[PDB]
Amino acid sequence: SPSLWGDQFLSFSIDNQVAEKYAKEIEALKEQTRNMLLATGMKLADTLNLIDTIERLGISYHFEKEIDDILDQIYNQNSNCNDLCTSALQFRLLRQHGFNISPEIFSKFQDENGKFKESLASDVLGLLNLYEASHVRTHADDILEDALAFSTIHLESAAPHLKSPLREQVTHALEQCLHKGVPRVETRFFISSIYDKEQSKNNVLLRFAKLDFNLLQMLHKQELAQVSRWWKDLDFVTTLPYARDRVVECYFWALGVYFEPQYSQARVMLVKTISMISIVDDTFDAYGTVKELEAYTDAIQRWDINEIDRLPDYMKISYKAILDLYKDYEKELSSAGRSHIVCHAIERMKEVVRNYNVESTWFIEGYTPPVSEYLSNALATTTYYYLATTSYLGMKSATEQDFEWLSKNPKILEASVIICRVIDDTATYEVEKSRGQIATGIECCMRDYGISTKEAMAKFQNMAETAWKDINEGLLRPTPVSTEFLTPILNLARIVEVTYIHNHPEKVLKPHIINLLVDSIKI
Ligand SMILES: CC(C)=CCC/C(C)=C/CC/C(=C/COP(=O)(O)OP(=O)(O)O)C(F)(F)F
Ligand SMILES: [Mg+2]
Ligand SMILES: [Mg+2]
Numbered sequence: 436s437p438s439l440w441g442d443q444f445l446s447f448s449i450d451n452q453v454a455e456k457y458a459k460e461i462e463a464l465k466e467q468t469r470n471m472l473l474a475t476g477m478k479l480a481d482t483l484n485l486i487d488t489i490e491r492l493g494i495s496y497h498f499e500k501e502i503d504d505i506l507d508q509i510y511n512q513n514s515n516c517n518d519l520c521t522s523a524l525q526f527r528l529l530r531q532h533g534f535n536i537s538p539e540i541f542s543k544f545q546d547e548n549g550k551f552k553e554s555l556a557s558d559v560l561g562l563l564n565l566y567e568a569s570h571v572r573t574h575a576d577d578i579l580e581d582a583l584a585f586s587t588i589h590l591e592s593a594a595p596h597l598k599s600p601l602r603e604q605v606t607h608a609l610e611q612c613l614h615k616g617v618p619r620v621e622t623r624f625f626i627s628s629i630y631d632k633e634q635s636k637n638n639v640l641l642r643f644a645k646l647d648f649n650l651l652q653m654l655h656k657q658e659l660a661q662v663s664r665w666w667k668d669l670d671f672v673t674t675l676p677y678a679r680d681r682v683v684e685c686y687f688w689a690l691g692v693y694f695e696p697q698y699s700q701a702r703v704m705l706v707k708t709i710s711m712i713s714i715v716d717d718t719f720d721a722y723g724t725v726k727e728l729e730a731y732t733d734a735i736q737r738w739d740i741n742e743i744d745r746l747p748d749y750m751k752i753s754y755k756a757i758l759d760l761y762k763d764y765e766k767e768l769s770s771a772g773r774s775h776i777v778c779h780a781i782e783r784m785k786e787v788v789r790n791y792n793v794e795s796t797w798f799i800e801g802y803t804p805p806v807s808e809y810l811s812n813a814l815a816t817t818t819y820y821y822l823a824t825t826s827y828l829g830m831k832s833a834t835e836q837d838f839e840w841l842s843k844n845p846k847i848l849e850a851s852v853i854i855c856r857v858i859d860d861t862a863t864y865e866v867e868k869s870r871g872q873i874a875t876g877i878e879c880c881m882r883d884y885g886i887s888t889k890e891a892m893a894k895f896q897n898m899a900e901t902a903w904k905d906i907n908e909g910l911l912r913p914t915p916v917s918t919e920f921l922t923p924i925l926n927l928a929r930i931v932e933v934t935y936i937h938n939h940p941e942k943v944l945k946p947h948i949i950n951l952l953v954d955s956i957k958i
Contacts, residue, residue, distance in 0.1 A: 438680040447660040449653055457650045464643035465497055472501040479514050480521045492644035493622030510534040519544050519561030523568040530571045533912040538576040556589045570614040573908040600632040615932045617691040623950045645956045654696055659686050662706050674752055677722040678714045685709040687948050691930040692923050701829020708825045714753055719791040732792040735785055779838045783821040790815040797874040809879040819852040826923040837916050847909030850902040851928040857895045858931050862938035
């Protein structure tokens, strides 16, 4: 199937004066907001609500300093808000920021038995904040064992009769929690659908939110244009017709990983890699013969233009483009003097390809390995180790030590990869089955444990839950590396959750792309 965008994003001219107009007013709105944070004499509930709203509006990235300092004090000053609402929110914010706040704060809301007091089933704002908090738990938070089921069942019961926009905020939460959703996608929904219709809205913050979102969108649109040009200048739609045309979608993913303007170069470098490996994938999946794929795999491992001759003409195209890309990366990084870090991404790509070849081998033989062995190859084929490594390329502050840490397959990274694999397998199962892919995960899980499809998918679901608790734990201080390098990994897992919601294709991404890159927010 072809791209349904056309050349809609191929050309974008920024309204220079509009940008300056917005940028100038934002600085003023930025200062007003800062003073709202640096403000003195505020209740706990009010301070946490301020932080939460600024974050949901997608503007918190301007007050990384301010918000941190405030949450730090709250952590240290351990409060006693007998309000479920403020407690759950206090818990979530701190946890999301790496503050290992004790889950004992919830015991006051549950009986001797250790279960949530059902007397709270009429505190909708409490249930909602508890619901959101339930997704930020780790393995040491069994006190929150049934917080999801509890808050969920009562919110569903309450929802139909709630006033707007609360009703829509709740209904949306039940379909997509905040912690596991894509930042820009959730920010878009909050600004446009909730806060804008909020009667108690703060006009300074709402205007600040809309202007910023729209200004960043102009930046994103410029980037997607440069990329759409770069992709067009390669012309893989006529030269390599078996490969998918999804550069726009590949950009949405780079955007899910990070949206900040400071990560402009990284995001562009990333989208290029995602698009490139997207071709290599289709090369192993739809086209290419066994004999052909081994030569491709082999050439990638050697990594030298001298190997092109050994490859069929069509694989010569892909292969040459791959080295040029990494050649382009080294040049961009030359200025900063970080040109050397490119090798890390390269070594990961080889790993993906090496495993792509293995995947096809298993397909031909009709091999159905045990889960242990299956995952030993299937994890890298998610490309997440490769994408996460690529993430650091454009991040001007990423050091050799950071790449060093990442190369050891840290648990947070490992968990992100597992979520991707597991979710993908549950969704694409029924499809790949009919294609003769008896090498799929759910198939291996059924043959290994001697269980049905449901049980297998259930076992996989638990693997993703375990994986999320691990990501949440991996964010707690002291973090192995700066949070700056953990977020991309966190975002990769969120993208998976967002793409395979309810485990269909670009039909799921279309609305997000329109709301994020096509339509601007009406002021
Ligand atoms: C599970 C997904 C789609 C999560 C979103 C992020 C992502 C993986 C970005 C990289 C792009 C790729 C997508 C391949 O998608 P698809 O061809 O369906 O995979 P499969 O052939 O292994 O089933 C690549 F081709 F590179 F593998
Ligand atoms: Mg594939
Ligand atoms: Mg799959």
